Design a protein around this ligand. Sequence first.
Ligand SMILES: Nc1ccn([C@H]2C[C@H](O)[C@@H](COP(=O)(O)OP(=O)(O)OP(=O)(O)O)O2)c(=O)n1
Ligand SMILES: [Ca+2]
Ligand SMILES: [Ca+2]
Ligand SMILES: [Ca+2]
Ligand SMILES: [Ca+2]
Ligand SMILES: [Ca+2]
Length: 903
Amino acid sequence: MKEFYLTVEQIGDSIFERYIDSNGRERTREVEYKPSLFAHCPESQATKYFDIYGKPCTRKLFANMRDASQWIKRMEDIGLEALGMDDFKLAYLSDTYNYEIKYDHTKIRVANFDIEVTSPDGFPEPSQAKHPIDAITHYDSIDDRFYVFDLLNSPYGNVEEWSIEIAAKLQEQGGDEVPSEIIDKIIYMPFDNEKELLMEYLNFWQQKTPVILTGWNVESFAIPYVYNRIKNIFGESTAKRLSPHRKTRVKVIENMYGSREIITLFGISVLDYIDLYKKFSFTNQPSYSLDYISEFELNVGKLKYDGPISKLRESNHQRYISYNIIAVYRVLQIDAKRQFINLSLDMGYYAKIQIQSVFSPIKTWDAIIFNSLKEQNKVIPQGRSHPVQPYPGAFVKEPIPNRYKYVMSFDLTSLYPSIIRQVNISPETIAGTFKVAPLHDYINAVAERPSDVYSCSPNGMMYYKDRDGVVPTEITKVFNQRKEHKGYMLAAQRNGEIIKEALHNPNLSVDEPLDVDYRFDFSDEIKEKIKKLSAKSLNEMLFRAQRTEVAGMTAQINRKLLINGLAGALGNVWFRYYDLRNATAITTFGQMALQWIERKVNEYLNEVCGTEGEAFVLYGDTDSIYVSADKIIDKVGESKFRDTNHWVDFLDKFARERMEPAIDRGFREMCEYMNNKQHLMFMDREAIAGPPLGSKGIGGFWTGKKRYALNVWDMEGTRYAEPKLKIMGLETQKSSTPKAVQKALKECIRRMLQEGEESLQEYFKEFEKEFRQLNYISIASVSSANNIAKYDVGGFPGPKCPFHIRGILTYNRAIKGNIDAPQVVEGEKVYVLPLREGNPFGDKCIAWPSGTEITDLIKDDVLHWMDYTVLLEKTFIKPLEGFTSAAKLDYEKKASLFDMFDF
DNA sequence: TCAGGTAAGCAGTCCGCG
DNA sequence: GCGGACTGCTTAC
Ligand SMILES: Nc1ccn([C@H]2C[C@H](O)[C@@H](COP(=O)(O)OP(=O)(O)OP(=O)(O)O)O2)c(=O)n1
Ligand SMILES: [Ca+2]
Ligand SMILES: [Ca+2]
Ligand SMILES: [Ca+2]
Ligand SMILES: [Ca+2]
Ligand SMILES: [Ca+2]
């Protein structure tokens, strides 16, 4: 077995490394690593080090790391470039692990924990840590055990021991329903005092020192609280035992509105699961409480308790501890699904970085590129200071707002990375510039050919064609990994649809799910067996298929994020290879590609339809085109089709056999025009959309840029058992839109697209009639809340006060002088409700923390003064009016001469 | 909201628009 | 009332 690092730190002139040795044991070592840096030289031909531009360099080997850093300073004082990896631990890892790291996750100690702290006077601030820690549950991945540390005696109450027997029981037996599958994995330790609890926890920590430390808000709450509480009680040296190297640092985290403090534990990699989720889940949520996210991800019920959490330990210590345990498990369950820890380890070891650096695409790419170049004895340039400057991005076509009955979409594969590879865009491949014409001249192929020697982008940049740049080389490797995982994801998706189809005809038998790999398309034999299965077995298979799809999605979408992040890093001032010429070369080439192919598709379809100057491409954004297919369908005639699937098959064939070849030819011509290194503009059919055959559905509509809805039957080769609504940008997709309103608007859209005007009018009438019954949370708006202080003038709205902030100030006056009332946290999200004229709150709206019930102090008054009329017009009617006007439809039946008779 | 990028939509404030 | 300038917040890509 090859060795692999666990953590790496620089402390003074020493590297501290925890690692798994060749025998599979965890070890720690201190290494007086001597770094090398580089300087340009005339020079001797006997040097083997060259910078990325091929200029010779001499290697300077330093007695220690502090000397290397001081040399970098002097080179700045002199005014000369100091070359090489200035983050010495990355250099250390590169030297020590000079091969593709093969890691064994079963040897990596992954800990997730959660603490409880009873506090009668508001939120227990981690910086103060003035209240006892009264529960800790710490799950260890190697032991596969939940270690529970329970405080029985506190200034806030003495309690009895937690009972595992009651914990296991149904809530209907008076129990806590701790999942039976973890009951035998709980190791319960009660303590008669907090000093002994904390001393034992530290001893335990020493024995089972986390490598990866996770949980929910551990970086912002649990770690700082534990550290500071131990500091308060025992002193600093004891608190630093949370670090395997006894080194910690208060770190100030800054943003534009203010700052906060965290504790850096040297020799541990903290991956707070809230931040993993925010980065990798590709959701935007109304609330990020563990309860809310658990319900969203796992469909588990809210953990129910009576009274405030500040009195939960005293009133029901049994439930208090059970819910602490369950909280830790819910994070494990989310990870079992989303696999963000796996992803982080995968990417971290690939790049050869501290695992926690996966949060930084810039740090990730710096290490990948450094390691690649080092292999060639090439020397990386010094990072430089650059002023932040705006630069142009993608093209978006202005659509004509309308209904669109039949639509086929086409999309470029991994556009920006494909552009980088096609054009050969890299720091070291810049060949020069050419004289640019207006972009429209390149789009229309009337501008002079930029170069007969070099590979070009319409921003005026030229690149070498003799060899691949390091950016193209390394981006290709990750692109290839992404493609493999996307393949598994789509197969799992297709397999899921086979199971859905079979669920129409389930067998009345007792059987088991098939043991299959959902990452590969089901064979004919598997399909035959599926048709013979019970509903229970099919549903279990569907769950597993959907879990496989989620696993593939995590692996693929985040590799996509990383590669797109390299294109973005070229436009970030902190990136070692920051260059607006390269960043703009990518974006400007993309603008041309989209508009180039729009023209080619229009020309092609006008030719096949025998028309002149008709717009077949109705819309496009960045790298996709949406093509009106009404004329194609009408050329055979709707009456000629047996069913919906029949015209779907037909459009699918037309897209693949006629349109994609035309698109390919168009892009090959563009490649030769720009004299690019390799043709990589691959534009495949994405969606096939239309109304059900024989229906009055409108199929799709656009209201404007980034705002459209389509009834989709096939997506990237997945033929759905039921048509799928693809809605982009509209209020149904916005976290700010109330939950019940998202749901109602989506149904309005479904009816528009699938059923027609009359169906839409029927639903609207009913929703308008009944909406006042809806639960207040489901009809509250949601917003992030920044600069509460800025707009606060003696508890009242200052000039230009945003609506949601006004709501917070209303709330703040209403709960004033109440220490136990939930506080709105700056930078987090709130529910917002409008209030009727003459309410006791003294203003037109109120806001409270999102994901929560509003305090019982004011709940009744809020419910009584809720402005349902304003709520409805603003969140429901106004957006619907936008949808319907765009689609040339009415949500309310217009009067006609026909109505009425029947006397 | 510490942590790659730009384009661009809508809510709301403030106030003009004879 | 609607739009323009502007802030705030949110999506699409
Ligand atoms: N978060 C994002 C998403 C998009 N884009 C840019 C880079 C993409 O290449 C391009 C098109 O976005 P897509 O969503 O269509 O994604 P890709 O084309 O990269 O991947 P694919 O279509 O293969 O899934 O827009 C970006 O810079 N950052
Ligand atoms: Ca808790
Ligand atoms: Ca794409
Ligand atoms: Ca595709
Ligand atoms: Ca069957
Ligand atoms: Ca796209």
